[model samples]
Target: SIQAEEWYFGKITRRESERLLLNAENPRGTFLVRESETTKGAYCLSVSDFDNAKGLNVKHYKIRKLDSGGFYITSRTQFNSLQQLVAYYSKHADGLCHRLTTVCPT
Candidate 1:
């Protein structure tokens, strides 16, 4: 059911994720989750924002897993599912560049 998650786009390339987030219609905090192409178990969290200096930029965060199978970005906190991770960041950015607002529409 993980793939059924709206925010999770399994195996989508980084460029593709960027294109989705970089859409002009997307406001700051729009984001999506994609599998990291370079790592077997790692994932990527792509977020779009209007950077003061960089202008429109899509930031990418690497999501790795523990040997115990929990998921984390900063490793300071981990979750049993991506659902929990998304929910947490939705309420607060914590360490993310921006608090997640909405999923990048497919």
Candidate 2:
């Protein structure tokens, strides 16, 4: 087995943080970020941004902006809860970030 690595993000404000869904269509940058429905678990990145700007399924997820200047995303998949999924993407950074930055909101 590979040695376990440790990662840490600074501190947090006792207040709640707004979770945003990250999506893109390039390197396929996708990760099972997280879910608040059941518990706190990661979610597989869903790159169904627009199958020709067609599959307009906005109710599931959308382009969520942030104040910290980072494009973290939440996505839809076969999982339904923390009691459901985790990050196990074999190919990460599938260009999701690029798509998000390049694609203008207007």
Best by lDDT: 1
Poorest lDDT segment (10 consecutive residues) of candidate 2: 1-10
* Model 1 lDDT tens row, 15-94: 89888888878888999888898988888989999877987779998989878878888778889987888888889888
Steric collisions counted per model: 0, 15
Per-residue accuracy of model 2 over 12-39 as CA lDDT, tens digit each: 2111111222333322222222123322
Full-model lDDT for every candidate: 0.87, 0.25
On the 0 to 100 scale, the lDDT of residue 102 in model 2 is 22
Query: Which residue pairs in model 1 clash with each other?
Result: none
Error of 1 at 92 (Å): 1.4
Candidate 2 regions with alpha-carbon error over 4 angstroms: 1-19, 22-28, 39-48, 55-88, 92-106
Q: Residue 7 in model 1: shift from native, Å?
A: 1.1
RMSD of each: 1.3, 12.7
- In candidate 1, where is summed lDDT lowest over 10 consecutive residues? 49-58
Give lDDT for model 2.
0.25
lDDT score for candidate 1 against the true structure? 0.87
